[PDB]
Amino acid sequence: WKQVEQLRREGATRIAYRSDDWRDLKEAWKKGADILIVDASRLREAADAARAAGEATGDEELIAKAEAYRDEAWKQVEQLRREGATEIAYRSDDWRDLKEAWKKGADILIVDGLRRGRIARELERLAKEEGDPALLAAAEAAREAAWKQVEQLRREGATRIAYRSDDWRDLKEAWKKGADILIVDNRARLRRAEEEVAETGDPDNEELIRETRERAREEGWKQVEQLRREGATEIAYRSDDWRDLKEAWKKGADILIVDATL
Ligand SMILES: [Cl-]
Ligand SMILES: [Cl-]
Ligand SMILES: [Cl-]
Ligand SMILES: [Cl-]
């Protein structure tokens, strides 16, 4: 936020902050974040392993009080929902976590299809390499596991359903299933692009990294441009690169997701 107001200077409107840390979430709330993105599944995994530490360390301050820690995490976020117009977006790939977040209170439910979409993509390509049509069908069911969560949330009456992926084809299909907010996550493309310049014979070449990271940016913006042609309205963009987020606003993304890395 000490360096995010540059995005607030141009266009602005909607800024989302992604974190599971309460201190950063509170500071983002006070700094004017329009949407807070909290991972209900990441908070659950840290919970089921917290009381596991209390069983290992030899301490009773943690055992029989872990249920108080979990409920406390829900309450501090729900209190933020009341005190302001800042929206709380809960994200998970797990159906029980989504219904729990809906019960606890959520303005946006984000069906996370990023990992499952990538696993389906690698299974499809692996099936093509093996010439196995059965593995093709296996790969397709890995994506429909996330689309079915979207359409079931639509059937039960969820108001604001979101979907996270890295590819416009998965997001368009989720959009047809009932998702209204399409989240493009471009962090992996920048990560892979930077990992490749480190493998070159001249990795310190400051000229050869500029366009390689740029090509990874155009691949992200291309997802936004194609979704804009299909007719999508609310498009969100996730990236840890400053130029990637700024230019994505001009491409058609009206929600920019920042985090502590920015
Ligand atoms: Cl095949
Ligand atoms: Cl909702
Ligand atoms: Cl997200
Ligand atoms: Cl895909």
Residue numbers in the entry: 7 to 268
In the authors' words:
In this work, we diversified a de novo TIM barrel by extending multiple βα‐loops using constrained hallucination. For the diversification experiment, we used the de novo TIM barrel sTIM11‐SB as the base scaffold. Here, we introduced two or three helical insertions into minimal loops in the de novo designed TIM barrel sTIM11‐SB.
In the case of HalluTIM3‐1, the crystal structure shows all three intended hallucinated extensions in their entirety, verifying their successful incorporation into sTIM11‐SB. One minor deviation between HalluTIM3‐1 and the base scaffold is observed within the N‐terminal α‐helix of the barrel, as these residues do not form a continuous α‐helix. In the case of HalluTIM3‐1, the crystal has an uncommonly high solvent content of 78% (Matthews coefficient: 5.6), that may influence the quality of the data and in combination with a certain flexibility of the extensions, lead to the rather noisy diffraction data. Upon comparison of the obtained crystal structures to corresponding structure predictions using ColabFold, we observed an accurate prediction for HalluTIM2‐2 with a root mean square deviation (RMSD) over all Cα atoms of about 1.2 Å but found major differences in the case of HalluTIM3‐1 as the RMSD over all Cα atoms is over 4.1 Å. The structure prediction shows straighter extensions, whereas two of the extensions in the crystal structure tilt more to the outside. When comparing each individual extension with the corresponding prediction, we observe accurate predictions below 1.0 Å RMSD except for the first extension of HalluTIM3‐1, which shows a higher deviation with 2.34 Å. For HalluTIM3‐1, where the crystal structure and prediction differ, we obtained varying qualities of the fits. The theoretical scattering curve of the predicted structure shows a high χ 2 of 8.9, whereas the crystal structure matches the experimental data with a significantly lower χ 2 of 2.0, indicating that the crystal structure matches the protein in solution more closely. In contrast, in HalluTIM2‐2 and HalluTIM3‐1, a major pocket is formed through the introduced fragments above the C‐terminal end of the inner β‐sheet. These pockets show differences in size with pocket volumes of 1006 Å3 in HalluTIM3‐1 and 2000 Å3 in HalluTIM2‐2.
